[PDB]
Symmetry: D2
Subunit: 190 residues, 4 copies
Amino acid sequence: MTKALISIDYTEDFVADSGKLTAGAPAQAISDAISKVTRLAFERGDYIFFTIDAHEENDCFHPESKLFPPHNLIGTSGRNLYGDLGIFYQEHGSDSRVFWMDKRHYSAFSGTDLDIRLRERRVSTVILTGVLTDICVLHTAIDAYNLGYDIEIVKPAVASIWPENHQFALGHFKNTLGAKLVDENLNELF
Amino acid sequence: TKALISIDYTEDFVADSGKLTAGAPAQAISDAISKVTRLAFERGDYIFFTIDAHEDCFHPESKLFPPHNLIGTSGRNLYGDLGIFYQEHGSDSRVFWMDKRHYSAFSGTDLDIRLRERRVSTVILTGVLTDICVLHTAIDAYNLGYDIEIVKPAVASIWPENHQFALGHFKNTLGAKLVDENLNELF
Amino acid sequence: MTKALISIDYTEDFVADSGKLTAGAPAQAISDAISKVTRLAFERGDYIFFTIDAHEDCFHPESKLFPPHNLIGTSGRNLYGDLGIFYQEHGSDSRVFWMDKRHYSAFSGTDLDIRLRERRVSTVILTGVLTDICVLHTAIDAYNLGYDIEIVKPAVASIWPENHQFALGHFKNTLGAKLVDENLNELF
Amino acid sequence: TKALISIDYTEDFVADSGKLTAGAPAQAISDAISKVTRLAFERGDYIFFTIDAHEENDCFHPESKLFPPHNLIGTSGRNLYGDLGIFYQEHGSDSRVFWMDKRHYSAFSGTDLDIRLRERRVSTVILTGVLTDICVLHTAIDAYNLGYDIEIVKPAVASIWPENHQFALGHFKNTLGAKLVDENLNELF
Ligand SMILES: [Zn+2]
Ligand SMILES: [Zn+2]
Ligand SMILES: [Zn+2]
Ligand SMILES: [Zn+2]
């Protein structure tokens, strides 16, 4: 029954209007659902992992730097969590069940110790939230699948810039990864 | 020197009576997939056939798709001229057959090890399906620091909108180069 | 309560007197204990993974370090002693696996971790040869992958007693492994 | 270009008053480890400091039962010992120098080391630090499985137990096919 909720890249740079790689409106639209579900997961005794892009300026060795403009730079406000989710972190970030995790690839597992931390705790299910549905959420989900985790996707708490991409990703999660789609109350959606 | 990965282009995925057939669009790439494989082989590239090998109540994929590519069945035989190429050159030191259980060609296999032994920097992806075993393989390759090439006329999906999502993902997110059956970049 | 026992390279080439990479007397001495403990684990309901060297290869760094051994399709890959009989009896059981490997570690380039995770196995029990090479590498990989570890002391062996002793110390003190006897009871 | 890995050469592992000190043998390599690191840097190599980062009362870490508290985040225990420390003050902000926190013994486990190396097409890793038979050994084995050529700087690795140091060196040479080199990065025969 040991579960972990993963909060992926829900920062000012991905969500806010002035954000450097902002998803804009669709990302902002999930603010209430993402904060509610994360607070709920925490209330249920789940582990919470904030897995956040930590980029550097002039990282010529990173293939991502040629693909997107500078975003989520180390030591910038762009890395601040957006909305009430940010308030949640300031309140509960010191709790032994809440984690902040820097990542450099899209997937929350790549080059991090997420798998190690989950295995230490004998977690068998990950609950995915954040942005973008078809990039960092999708990559994290695929890695989770290959690492043998059960997957839940919080449908109203994931978002993409592109609606067709969001739809592809949701279908992929359900039909290919065998993931459970859930709402903000963590109830399965049929 | 690069490596061409041939993903799941078997009877069960391609033939009209295949257990998990992609049908017409998978059949449509037969000429292109075999042309580009022979071409890559001609110019000294390594060839990795990464093929579903299914049996298995502990595999989560059992719930998601009907039995396909079962061991010892003709369903695992490579489709078309690609099977002919393997019959001719499967024993060449640069050609490989790898059994896999997940979608990604890297998951639970020694693909990364074999590529690293040969100091390969670039993988060229062919096969089916674009949005499942090709997409998963591409993403694993990206995370493992490989340069990626996708042979656009040698990948196929059941649904054209999924094939289009995957192609866009390769270019815009993974930084892959889309190439034609002559291994020339597309513009 | 269900665990996995890993049976590492206990084959003719590593054990038999004419073996291509034979560990000789100390490897032969564990034959009774390794078969006893494997049968006990299987009877208990545990999963059994035979993780066996499958060699061919100028590209393999190991080819320069050891003479040819456990070559694919040769008798050097046959399991040694009563262990071979257990495999004849139960090799087709859904709980028993034969796994080819190219590195020393049973995890490296294999699907061992995946198979264990499918089954929610939290504890691996290690047996076989050599204590300081394929058992050590496998133990280290298991540790980094968050498995609890048991080492069957009378069912592991090395060519050199000092290497065998180093490895056993490393398992207990660094990896936090439980050392057990052939009855799967902890040793004190 | 190669990468030199500097493993756990900190106060807690080296200094007389270190919480998990290897003592005199670890102190004895201070000159060699600092010399070889400055040399690798001069030669244009990448330098990775891979340093234990433990927390007090981490009940979920299996290492917590095995050793007393050591290299705690925000303590002096994590300070690089000797001239290596001075080198880090001098060049830590350089593009080729990296500081990597680790929780397991191996420098690769749960880190982005492999990712950073492959971004640079590094094919050979040069290993230094402590302990020879624990964080150096684990790092070497991980490097081997990941297909890296390995160099071990013999006078720049140390263990608390000399027999364990001897086992590890033999293992590197005979099992991993590593090249043993001196503080001048010249092969030892
Ligand atoms: Zn990013
Ligand atoms: Zn399949
Ligand atoms: Zn071998
Ligand atoms: Zn430590």
